[PDB]
Design an enzyme around this catalytic site. Structure first.
Site, short mmCIF file in Angstrom:
data_model
loop_
_atom_site.label_atom_id
_atom_site.label_comp_id
_atom_site.label_asym_id
_atom_site.label_seq_id
_atom_site.Cartn_x
_atom_site.Cartn_y
_atom_site.Cartn_z
N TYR B 160 0.78 -1.23 0.00
CA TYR B 160 0.00 0.00 0.00
C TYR B 160 0.82 1.30 0.00
CZ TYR B 160 -4.24 -2.86 0.46
OH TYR B 160 -5.23 -3.79 0.23
N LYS B 227 1.62 -13.82 6.48
CA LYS B 227 1.91 -14.88 5.51
C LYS B 227 3.40 -15.21 5.53
CE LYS B 227 -0.56 -17.34 2.67
NZ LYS B 227 -0.33 -18.79 2.57
N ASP B 281 -4.38 -16.55 5.33
CA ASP B 281 -5.58 -17.17 4.76
C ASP B 281 -6.25 -18.08 5.80
OD1 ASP B 281 -3.48 -18.93 4.48
OD2 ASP B 281 -3.98 -19.76 2.54
N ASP B 305 -6.55 -4.72 6.16
CA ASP B 305 -7.59 -4.24 5.24
C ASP B 305 -8.57 -5.40 4.92
OD1 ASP B 305 -7.76 -3.55 1.76
OD2 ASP B 305 -8.72 -2.25 3.16
#
Ligand SMILES: O=P(O)(O)O[C@@H]1[C@H](O)[C@@H](COP(=O)(O)OP(=O)(O)OC[C@H]2O[C@@H](O)[C@H](O)[C@@H]2O)O[C@H]1n1cnc2c1ncn1ccnc21
Lengths: 427, 424
Positions: B160, B227, B281, B305
């Site tokens: 971002y 992750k 995830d 987000d």
């Protein structure tokens, strides 16, 4: 029997090879299908998948079709027999058969996460990761689970998952920081780790063409591009633009964009056309939760595809049941999303549904034997409805005695054997 | 109503919030800025000011009062001031320390992605805080009533940060050849390229603020969402650095999952915060499957987000989601929703998101924690008795929507009538 070397490679006696020429897959009625038992629960769930598939094909085709299973080795059985985890012969074997069903593999040593799976995809150029998510009537945390019927086409070679990154304290990182600063006037903190996110036109197109082909072959009416193109303009935004571009370039007569519908067609998707639209990634997540009936085929870059497929599986109470397949041009290897589940290995407790549904995706969708998919899905729905299920599902059902893996296998086979085809295969 | 710096002056009846040595100190007649902004903006903020003042009048008896100070941004700034975001407005926030704003329109060609980017950067609001709670609305998640989370999202770094180059740009070509010569890394000629930076400094700051919030709110779990299995040196480092600072600065207040298993028989001691981590995830899957297992979530920019958005959808709270951007002794609260141009002026809009932003500011950052109990109580009551706006009414068969102003009044009554012995 299973081969360790190239010279030893020979498909079993009365099987014929699946072939791929001129953009077209040719599947004989006695096709060779490679299988890899893999690791952990893999052998058990692979064994169950072969039995269920065999019963399904006998049932719907009555001898006019038969799979000729060809065992190849990867993981612990390959170490035992061949002295290595991934024989070259295994890779060449898959390449020869074009189609393979595999169990999960353990990650070796201190190598990458699922390095054996990565080595397989890379050697065979399996660029598309395909994950269908459907509901089978199980206990589910989503009120709208029964309206979730989706497939995620996930680009599986690029993005942040490509492995391009350097430690914060590495001389590589320091060199990049300096390069960025002197050349582009870009400032990155001295204590920052650094990753690179590549997204290419080529990889996006290949993936989108395959997604669009699935939609046409399955009669899907919406293909949704999931991207964060508002923030990441030149990677994810580009993914989105290139995906639209190839749709209009190569499938013009079959598609209409959301833009065209809302200014050319008066809010109504014309009959016979696929709607191609796009959603901002975080909004896409919200939308499968809020309006899952609005989505069918989802096309995403690597990370987005990973997230949305997992979220969808959870919504339907399908975490341990999720199937997937990694597909190249005229070649595919199917396998469950789940790992080796070491604590369940060899205990006849594991749910084999994921592996079964992986075989069902390989044979029913990639190989085109749709009725095999129909009857297998039917059998699973029936078992769920009748509360004839493994513990992972049974624990959520009052009064129900869980089935062992082997028992559940035989239950699916009974349902398949007893099925009224006039009802099962209608429409 | 100010247009420039050398005309900033708090309303005469009030006192300034001050920050001093990592400690917020708040007077009982505080100045809190408010920006009406664009579209539904002015409306929802108007409703918010009226609700919070009822909340404070009731909960404290009149020993406390807010002194609201109007600053401008967006359509009302370009009207009176000549520009979309006065330097004044920004400096007024830095002075007041606490601010409530409505949503804003960004015209194209400004240089920023959103005018909000500009405000965060100027004020160093590195942490984006989003609480997600259920208020009894129609919701798609069977387990919505067990979603009670706060997402601490690092709001300055990650993909971002805007570091990227078009596939066909000379800059992309230069980077491609630098990466190939120097590190033997090959990227395709037709690839767009982004950089994902994650820093020790930014992670630590975020994690510290998360742990402080946990301690202040009696949270028992803080979960790092990463992750790190695939992105070892960005998201994995984020994870390592977050753990490292928890153990370094909050040792006596925290415990890991391994420690709970080895030292405490698998049971978390009541006065300790469990600090753990989940693959990103899987975390998405886990808020869907076992929401009761999560409270404070600490994530880098993108992960935060995604997870906050997912969680809001689960509770049927997409248009009710509140947010706050926080720096070191400064905070600006605002709805997650946009301007909603078609509802602008039409007295139709659900003001809950802005009310909750206020109550997050005044009750969670300014610390008047009884103000949040009664505001949240009031909203649940309104929803339970089906006295709500059309966004909510449309999922309730046979219910007639209340207007924005009507809902505001309803909430006021529920606050003034409440039994403090049961709510507090
Ligand atoms: O989709 P399925 O499962 O193949 O189910 C198919 C398909 O639905 C229909 C005709 O196949 P096709 O895909 O070529 O045509 P239409 O639907 O346009 O008959 C079924 N079928 C049953 N036995 C066989 C078979 N198809 C090929 N076989 C060859 C030998 N044994 C078979």
């Amino acid at each position: 029997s299973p081969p360790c070397t190239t010279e030893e490679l020979s498909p079993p006696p009365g099987g014929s090879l699946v072939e791929y020429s001129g953009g077209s897959l040719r599947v004989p009625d006695n096709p060779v299908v490679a299988f890899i038992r893999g690791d952990g629960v893999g052998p058990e769930v692979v064994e169950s998948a072969l039995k269920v598939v065999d019963a399904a094909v006998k049932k719907v085709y009555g001898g006019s079709r038969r799979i000729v299973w060809w065992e190849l080795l990867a993981g612990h059985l390959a170490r035992e027999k061949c002295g290595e985890l991934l024989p070259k012969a295994t890779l060449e074997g898959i390449r020869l058969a074009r189609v393979a069903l595999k169990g999960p593999l353990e990650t070796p040593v201190g190598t990458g996460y699922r390095s054996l799976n990565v080595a397989i995809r890379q050697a065979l150029d399996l660029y598309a990761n395909i994950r269908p998510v459907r509901y089978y009537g199980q206990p589910a945390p989503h009120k709208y689970a029964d309206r979730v019927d989706m497939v995620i086409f996930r680009e599986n070679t690029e993005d942040v998952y490509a492995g391009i990154e350097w430690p914060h304290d590495s001389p590589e990182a320091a060199r990049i920081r300096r390069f960025l600063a002197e050349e582009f006037g870009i400032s990155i903190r001295e204590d920052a780790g650094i990753g690179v996110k590549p997204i290419s036109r080529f990889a996006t197109r290949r993936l989108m063409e395959r997604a669009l082909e699935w939609a046409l072959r399955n009669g899907n009416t919406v293909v949704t591009i999931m991207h964060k193109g508002n923030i990441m303009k030149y990677t994810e935004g580009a993914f989105m633009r290139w995906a639209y571009e190839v749709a209009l370039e190569k499938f013009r007569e079959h598609v209409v964009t959301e833009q065209e519908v809302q200014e050319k067609y008066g809010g109504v998707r014309p009959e016979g056309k696929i709607l191609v639209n796009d959603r901002i990634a975080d909004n896409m997540l919200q939308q499968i939760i809020t309006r899952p009936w609005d989505y069918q085929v989802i096309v995403a870059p690597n990370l987005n595809g990973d997230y949305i497929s997992d979220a969808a599986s959870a919504l339907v109470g399908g975490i341990g049941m999720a199937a997937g397949m990694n597909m190249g041009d005229g070649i595919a290897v199917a396998e469950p999303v789940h790992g080796t589940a070491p604590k369940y290995a060899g205990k006849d407790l594991i749910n084999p549904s994921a592996e079964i549904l992986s075989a069902s995706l390989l044979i029913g969708e990639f190989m085109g034997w749709r009725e095999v998919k129909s009857i297998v899905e039917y059998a699973i729905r029936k078992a769920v409805q009748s509360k004839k299920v493994t513990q992972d599902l049974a624990r959520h059902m009052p009064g129900v005695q869980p089935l062992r893996t082997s028992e559940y296998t035989e239950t699916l086979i009974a349902y398949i054997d007893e099925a009224d085809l006039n009802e099962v295969l209608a429409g």
